[PDB]
């Protein structure tokens, strides 16, 4: 199925089923979480001429990055526009792996993939790991 800019999605991980949850706690961190259709859980993409970003339903911040790209980097929301790349996976064209832009981090569902509602999502080096993978679909 097609992923297109102005509509939103759903982000889940491939290995834990969890999904991209912007946390209710903070409003700020990003964490893998099981689906309830909160807007907290849903993303709308825009393709900017030239990468992706990802505009949070609830809160309007964007899905963006704690420092400098880096294995164990945290995802959390930032108020300006942050691109990535967003590419089919290799051996899965049904998934998708999102990158920092021109870099080999992808995001990664932390503790390789634990479902443990709360676990947070990060940056790690691109590599065949499961949970480095995910779904985009419709909420
Ligand atoms: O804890 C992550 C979890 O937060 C939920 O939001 C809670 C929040 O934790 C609580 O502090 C606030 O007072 O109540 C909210 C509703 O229970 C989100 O619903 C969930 O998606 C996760 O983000």
């Known amino acids: 199925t097609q992923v297109s800019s102005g509509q939103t999605y759903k982000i889940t991980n491939v290995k834990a089923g969890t999904v991209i949850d912007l946390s209710g706690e903070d409003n ?10 909160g807007k907290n859980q849903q ?3 825009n393709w900017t001429g030239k990468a ?7 809160s309007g911040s964007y899905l963006g990055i704690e420092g ?3 294995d164990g980097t945290r995802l959390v929301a930032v108020n300006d526009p942050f691109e990535w790349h967003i590419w089919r996976d ?12 021109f870099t080999n981090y992808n995001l990664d569902l932390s503790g390789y993939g634990d479902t443990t509602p709360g676990t ?19 909420p």
């Open 28 to 37: 700020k961190s990003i964490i893998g979480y099981p689906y309830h259709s």
């Open 43 to 45: 993303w709308t993409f």
């Open 52 to 58: 992706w970003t990802l505009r949070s339903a609830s």
């Open 68 to 70: 400098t790209p880096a």
């Open 90 to 101: 290799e051996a899965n064209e049904n998934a998708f792996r999102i990158f920092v832009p």
């Open 120 to 138: 947070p999502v990060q940056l790690w080096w691109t590599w065949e790991g499961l949970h480095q993978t995910w779904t985009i679909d419709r």
